[PDB]
Amino acid sequence: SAEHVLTMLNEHEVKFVDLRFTDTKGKEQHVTIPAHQVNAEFFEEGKMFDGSSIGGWDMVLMPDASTAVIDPFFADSTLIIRCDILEPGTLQGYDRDPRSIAKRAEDYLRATGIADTVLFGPEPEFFLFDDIRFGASISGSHVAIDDIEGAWNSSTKYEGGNKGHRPGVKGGYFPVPPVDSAQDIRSEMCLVMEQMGLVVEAHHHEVATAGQNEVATRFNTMTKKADEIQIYKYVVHNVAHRFGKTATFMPKPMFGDNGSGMHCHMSLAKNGTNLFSGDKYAGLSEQALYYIGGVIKHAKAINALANPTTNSYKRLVPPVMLAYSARNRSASIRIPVVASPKARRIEVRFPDPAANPYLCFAALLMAGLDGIKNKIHPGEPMDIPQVAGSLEEALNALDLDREFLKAGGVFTDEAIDAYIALRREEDDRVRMTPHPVEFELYYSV
Amino acid sequence: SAEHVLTMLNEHEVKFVDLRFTDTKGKEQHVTIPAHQVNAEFFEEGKMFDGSSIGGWDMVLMPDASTAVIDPFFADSTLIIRCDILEPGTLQGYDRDPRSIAKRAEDYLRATGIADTVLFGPEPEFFLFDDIRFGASISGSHVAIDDIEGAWNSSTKYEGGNKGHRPGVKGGYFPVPPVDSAQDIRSEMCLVMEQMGLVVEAHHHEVATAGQNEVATRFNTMTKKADEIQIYKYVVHNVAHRFGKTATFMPKPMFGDNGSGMHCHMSLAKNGTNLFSGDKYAGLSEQALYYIGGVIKHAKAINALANPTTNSYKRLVPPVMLAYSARNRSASIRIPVVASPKARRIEVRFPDPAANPYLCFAALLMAGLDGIKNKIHPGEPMDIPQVAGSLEEALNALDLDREFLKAGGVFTDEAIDAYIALRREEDDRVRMTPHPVEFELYYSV
Amino acid sequence: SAEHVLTMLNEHEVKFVDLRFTDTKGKEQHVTIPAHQVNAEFFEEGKMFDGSSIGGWDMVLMPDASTAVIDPFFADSTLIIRCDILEPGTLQGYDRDPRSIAKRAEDYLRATGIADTVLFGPEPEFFLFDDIRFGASISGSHVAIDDIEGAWNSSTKYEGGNKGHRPGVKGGYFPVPPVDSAQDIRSEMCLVMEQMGLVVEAHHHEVATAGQNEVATRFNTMTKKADEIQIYKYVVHNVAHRFGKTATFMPKPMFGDNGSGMHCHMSLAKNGTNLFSGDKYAGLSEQALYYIGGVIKHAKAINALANPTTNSYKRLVPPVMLAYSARNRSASIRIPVVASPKARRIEVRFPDPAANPYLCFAALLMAGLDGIKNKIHPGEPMDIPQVAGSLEEALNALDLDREFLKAGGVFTDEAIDAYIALRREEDDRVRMTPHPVEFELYYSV
Numbered sequence A, B, C: 001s002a003e004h005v006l007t008m009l010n011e012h013e014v015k016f017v018d019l020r021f022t023d024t025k026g027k028e029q030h031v032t033i034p035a036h037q038v039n040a041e042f043f044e045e046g047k048m049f050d051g052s053s054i055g056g057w058d059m060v061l062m063p064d065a066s067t068a069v070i071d072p073f074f075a076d077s078t079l080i081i082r083c084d085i086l087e088p089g090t091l092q093g094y095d096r097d098p099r100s101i102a103k104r105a106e107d108y109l110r111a112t113g114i115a116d117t118v119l120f121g122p123e124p125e126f127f128l129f130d131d132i133r134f135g136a137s138i139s140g141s142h143v144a145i146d147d148i149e150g151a152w153n154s155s156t157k158y159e160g161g162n163k164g165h166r167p168g169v170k171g172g173y174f175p176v177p178p179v180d181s182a183q184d185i186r187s188e189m190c191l192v193m194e195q196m197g198l199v200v201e202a203h204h205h206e207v208a209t210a211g212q213n214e215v216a217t218r219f220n221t222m223t224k225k226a227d228e229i230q231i232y233k234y235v236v237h238n239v240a241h242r243f244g245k246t247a248t249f250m251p252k253p254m255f256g257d258n259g260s261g262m263h264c265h266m267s268l269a270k271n272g273t274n275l276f277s278g279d280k281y282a283g284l285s286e287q288a289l290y291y292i293g294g295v296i297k298h299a300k301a302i303n304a305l306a307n308p309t310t311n312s313y314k315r316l317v318p319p320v321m322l323a324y325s326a327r328n329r330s331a332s333i334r335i336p337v338v339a340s341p342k343a344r345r346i347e348v349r350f351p352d353p354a355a356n357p358y359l360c361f362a363a364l365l366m367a368g369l370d371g372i373k374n375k376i377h378p379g380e381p382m383d384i385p386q387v388a389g390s391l392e393e394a395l396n397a398l399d400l401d402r403e404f405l406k407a408g409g410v411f412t413d414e415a416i417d418a419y420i421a422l423r424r425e426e427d428d429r430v431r432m433t434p435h436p437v438e439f440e441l442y443y444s445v
């Protein structure tokens, strides 16, 4: 409540308040107010900003006082407050603001009465490098990745000495220190995440050489979890930075080793009960099977939001199979063997950290409801259709399979059109710029 | 009062008093007295200095005891006192001293009875670089800008490692840390500004890559705000310096990305009421519309003072349109959608941080009054005339549209002539020195 | 004649024929045919090329067989043939092709009966440097000039030893070797020019340090002389190159020392007699005085063609005075003291080597005829109006004083409009790119 934020301000000698919001692409934006400008008026009628120079968008920042967290990194005491972008005076909420779209998808779920709450559990992976250099110019282009754990540094002269314990290319999965250099960086990330209100469940090194890592975090309701992904990413980016590292959530930074995916565990609940539990395949309800059928029916349109970068598809090369299974980890829909009670859920394996968590989760939910809503029966478990094979395909697919997103006003046409417009500009730059392996393949033609 | 300054001296064990004043170009000058020379005589009959070697000007420094601030940076305890330049013995105030000219424009407003007070709200932007090298010689010339946030450093080898989070060319507008490197430098700038008597409203990164920033600051009456711009600039220059950065207020340091403008919000008030509020276009009074009409009528003469550098016009290339609007941000006069009560005001978007805040504000006020004073009706909102396209144009225009500035003795002819003389010398050096892209364009002729 | 070219081909074992033409900007273009494609058909119906990618313009190259010269530089025996650009099939001559425009201005002179021939004598100056580096990018810009003769190298360590005889900044005018490093390079330029059909009169070092030079060459009729300037420039550029130097015709490469101008000596003749000789001021006819009056009347429009680069105006800073005189070398129209018979002529001092010699000469002639044609009496000799002070001014002036150029179809409106369009693009790049002395002037604002 406003009341509560106002005590924290004194209770913490807060010098500044950081207004934060997420844009269409997914990047957390922010503007800073002195604490002495937080008073009634503020939580009442928000603060005006020029929304015009935000990519894909005067507007009003409306502070959500439930979100107040103290920033673990800025030097002066700062209280972060997440905001919604509202349409000014009229005060309804930009239909292009991803947090508003997430909130709408949650209310539409309630209005359909299929369940009261959506529970999301994203598993975001990241890379933690020491040096990343890249560039493109008329005379050429390059990218150079470097990290102490890179299997390629086995030959490197280091002046401290080389020391040689390092994860080989698919060998980052699990060896104790010193092969895993990041135990203290991940534990620190866990402690700062909890200080910001997240609940860590586990942290470990991932499969790739050169710093792949994962901090596993307890689930939440869709829009709250989407904000927790924005804090997750902020803590990973800044703790890495304090440690002299650079972290990245891009899906596929290295060819020849693992990519970073963000698998979404989903579940639905009506009056304190898990609608996905039941009889049917592996403890699932018929309700749950239609949710899977809706996700599979709309997978390529979902890919435009859950895999929104041209790089995403370097990862999604032959979890490409649109199929559910408790057995086949090759099927993009895994039914986790919970064994346990009514933690029954589905896991969609194909999205990646580059996805805007609000739009990505809203689209998975809207697809899953359209399955239920039309008895779209999934089929049989593989123990056969595939995800979009490229961003251009995914964008065409979103453009044509636009209907399930527009249900109940969650996502307008202007919103979907402006989104495809942004992603197309990106796709073009990648399409028109010659790639280094083309010189390898075609220079002596 | 003198009395008050004299207590602060003991109350702070002040070792020195720094006498400060602004020259015609806008640069804050200063001379330092030991605290033990501040006594009755001082606040009474000022201190003599050789005014002769100040560009464009024995004279007397008259301490304004209302302005006493402790300097947050000098090692020994120092009390800053702003001064006015007075004509010696006779004690009236140099008609070429920009602070005196500002004070005269405020009294002339009172003498016309159109309002009691002018309220100015400048929005100055700046750049925060790490390295700036430049030079011109017979055999050539160069400038080299560098900053950690420069999109161009994506390819750079750094020996710490490169870390790669950086604002792209028009992408400095708003991303959270680590992409925005300056959160602590701007918050610190905010805290030192307030310690010097300013009220910060907000601080944020601006649109440009390579360190564009903005600290938004609460309005004031014209001459007081013009001094607050001189403190604003002093704090930005010295906090940046403590941080190992170099700040600059020049309008256009980089081609191909945003420039730093200083938009002036203006409003007029008679007996505690906002004369700019009313009926008419977007909450405006007819009074306000004539103010806009005077600004537009005299825009090119105002440009010689509000855009006084040849570099200013590298920014003002196709807010060039002399038009008012609540809608068109392309119109140089924006009527801000206050929505709120009688914070109704106009915003002139075209001036830049290089402007002498006293002369720039005095000229906007004198132009705006001549509009009121002659019912110079602005026209209709673009939702078509332009600003001077060059300093030479702006200087010719000031020279011919000299009358509205001379009203009530605000600005003499000698004052306007000496000003154009200074700005012409500058224009010539830029006009006669061959430019690097000319070799690109014409060497193989 | 075709017949003649065809013998030279055998007479010289010519392996290739180089088709050359000049574009709107003045740069000589070329395409190469094997000698075995020169036959009747060729001199008859020309050769087709894509005129579309020439700046400011399928078309036909029509070989002018009078122009055949052997190329003194290509390794394989090549015969250069100058061409006219004709409108295809219809075969009339592009009204935007500068050589055609020159030929039209000569025929219009004949059709007016004022004289049979125009005689032009351009005095082009050039610079001969060793190293020229420059560039402009978002993070900055630079130009670096270097030559062994640069007064600035007096301090330079050279590893051969420094040897120290060098022209000081305005001291390149006339000292014997070793101070003048270019005696053999200029004599060689003279011998190759004559081998290409030009008649050298004198060669000498010019006023500037760092390699300013001049090869003086015997006059000709307008279009023939305009082609001789294109050969002049080609020989200077390639002999310099063989010598390890780089030559440039740009008007003002160095601030603080002389610029390279191309003064045009002009004269008119009817039935073997010099119309410019007579009684009146300094041996001049009344006919000649009206020619001067037309040049002065149209000077700023002529500047858009005779001084077509933004750099041109770095040279034309306070021969700026539009005045004739036998005495005042400050007057842009000098009446040379011939003393001798009826070599009486006028000299216009203001054009520079960057000018397209066809369009520059055609415009001086058309202006001079409009003087005669309307008795535009010049005035009295200075022993007061000036040339355009910038390319933008010159381009506005050409755009408005368009009439005298359109006389008799010499220059169409499309031709004049496309020309201003090209020169404007150039002016803009120079106007929008920040200049290095602006950082010197305004960084600490």
Ligand SMILES: N[C@@H](CCC(=O)O)C(=O)O
Residues within 6 Å of the ligand: A125, A258, A259, A260, A261, A262, A315, A349
């Ligand atoms: N990192 C894998 C996911 C690994 C896993 O299944 O644990 C991906 O690219 O999605």
Ligand SMILES: N[C@@H](CCC(=O)O)C(=O)O
Residues within 6 Å of the ligand: A050, B125, B258, B259, B260, B261, B262, B315, B349
């Ligand atoms: N920086 C812009 C102003 C940006 C804005 O309108 O917020 C300028 O050059 O004036």
Ligand SMILES: N[C@@H](CCC(=O)O)C(=O)O
Residues within 6 Å of the ligand: C125, C258, C259, C260, C261, C262, C315, C349
């Ligand atoms: N080089 C001079 C001309 C020198 C001369 O008159 O001989 C110019 O800039 O035009």
Ligand SMILES: [Mn+2]
Residues within 6 Å of the ligand: A123, A125, A206, A214
């Ligand atoms: Mn994982």
Ligand SMILES: [Mn+2]
Residues within 6 Å of the ligand: A123, A263, A347
């Ligand atoms: Mn999983």
Ligand SMILES: [Mn+2]
Residues within 6 Å of the ligand: B123, B125, B206, B214
């Ligand atoms: Mn701004």
Ligand SMILES: [Mn+2]
Residues within 6 Å of the ligand: B123, B263, B347
């Ligand atoms: Mn503004």
Ligand SMILES: [Mn+2]
Residues within 6 Å of the ligand: C123, C125, C206, C214
């Ligand atoms: Mn000469």
Ligand SMILES: [Mn+2]
Residues within 6 Å of the ligand: C123, C263, C347
């Ligand atoms: Mn001469």
